[PDB]
Amino acid sequence: RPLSLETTITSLTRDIITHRFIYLINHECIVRKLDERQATFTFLVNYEMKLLHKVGSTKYKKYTEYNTKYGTFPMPIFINHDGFLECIGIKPTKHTPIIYKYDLNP
Ligand SMILES: [Cl-]
C-alpha cells in the first residue's frame, strides 16, 4: 500500500508555495523588471530554499535527484503586463494540472 515521493513532494509544494511566496516573486519581478528566464530562476531559488529549510539536507538531496529524473518540482506560470511579469500560479509537477493564485493557501 506504499506512499511514493511524488505525493509527499506535491504536498510539500502546496505548503511552500503560498500567496505570500507568490507576493515576494511578483515584487522582485516588478522591482528588478525580470524576463521569464530570470523570474523562473528567482522562483526556483526561493522554492529550493524553503524546501531545504523544511526537510533538511538528506531529504532535500533525495527530492532534488528525484526531480532530475521525474520532473516533480513545480514550474511557475507567468503572464506579461507590458514588460512586467506576474506569477499567477504553478504546475506542481510534469503530470499535474495548473493551480491558479486564487486556489493557493494564504
Ligand atoms: Cl487545480
100 Cα–ligand 1 center, Å? 7
Burial of 2 (0-12, 13-18, 19+ CB in 10 A): exposed
Resolution (A): 2.8
User: What residues does each domain of the chain span?
Assistant: 5-101
30 Cα–ligand 1 center, Å? 26
Give the technique used to solve this structure: X-ray
63 Cα–ligand 1 center, Å? 23
Q: What is the DSSP letter of 93?
A: S
Segment holding 31, helix H or strand E: helix 19-31
Residue with cell 503530470: 95
97 Cα–ligand 1 center, Å? 6
CA gap 11, 57 in Å, rounded? 18
